[model samples]
Target: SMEQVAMELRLTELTRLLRSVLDQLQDKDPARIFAQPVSLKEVPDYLDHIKHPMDFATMRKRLEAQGYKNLHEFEEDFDLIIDNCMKYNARDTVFYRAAVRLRDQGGVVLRQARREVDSIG
Candidate 1:
């Protein structure tokens, strides 16, 4: 017999898709600057500008706990991470372009997951 019921099965798919997007996003951060929290020692003014600081490390931790409310919540958190970068750094900076690239790559994963999951009931 199959192990779980329909609801849990659906949720399992959700988690799997979430993991894909997270992995893609993490891969985009070559320097690991966005992978972990921004250091106060490196940029003391970071907190002053960014209201919400989301990183791949925090996202991974939250994902491990299955703390996301829904798919949209994941979408929001991902955007927030990118937005923080765009907000903190000027358009001329590598950080901005890095986040832009991350956003594009992550969206590819997101769309892939959504397309697959939508194929489900």
Candidate 2:
């Protein structure tokens, strides 16, 4: 039917427009905002509220995208981040500790040859 063909053509055009809009919206990268190293003074307290090791795992990826190859690289910022986590709710420290330990074992820890013994989140 001619009417059915017209409706189908309209639907295809609408879908094409929708796809273009979505393509524009998807241009922003997830790591765009985290592209720079988070400074110590800029560390947000929201990290203190993280409740799970998996959450830290996700954040670790973002940090790594910002050139943070090792935990020691973020020493100053993590001190505040970890302290905030401890001060607000000590129970969550277990999750933080677990995440940190995993990263440590994952080779994110400060290397002995670097002469940096300090650790970070």
Candidate 3:
């Protein structure tokens, strides 16, 4: 029960935070700097559709191989974009990754809980 409650709260917080990040970057296509530019439109759907925990260790390794200096770069960039729009120093690129990590963590919780239920059944 505690785990479930924690999972729900984390999901809610992540959803709200993600929405705030998107709202902050609404004015610009911040993804322009990236090759595909992470998609923001389907983020909620992606979150809702999460079924299994991702292999974050592997993901991190792959990202590191790609020369990413930081995991929160995208979120940082989004913050920069917001600052720039407000006529302040715009820094940029952390939202999507954080959202995915949240989803992955949720998926892990959901998967483990489902396993517990199935074992009992």
The TM-scores of all predictions, comma-separated, are 0.83, 0.26, 0.26
- Candidate lDDT (C-alpha), each: 0.81, 0.38, 0.38
Q: State the lDDT of candidate 3 residue by residue for 23-73, as single tens digits.
A: 333323334322232233844443343332232232334343442322244
- TM-score sort, best first: 1, 2, 3
Residue-wise C-alpha lDDT for candidate 2, range 17-106, written one tens digit per residue = 333322332232232322233333665654455432122333445443443433344443434434444444456556345434433442
Question: Which candidate wins on TM-score?
Answer: 1
Off by over 4 Å in 2: 1-55, 69-73, 90-113, 116-121
Best by lDDT: 1
Clashes of 2: 0
Error of 1 at 102 (Å): 1.0
Worst 10 residues of 2 by lDDT: 112-121
Clashes of each: 0, 0, 11
TM-score of 2: 0.26
Q: In model 3, where is the ten-residue run with the lowest total lDDT?
A: 82-91
Give the per-residue lDDT of model 1 (tens digit) for 1-121.
Answer: 2645766666766887788778877887887768888888998988999989988888899887877746788888888989999989999998899999888877778787667766753
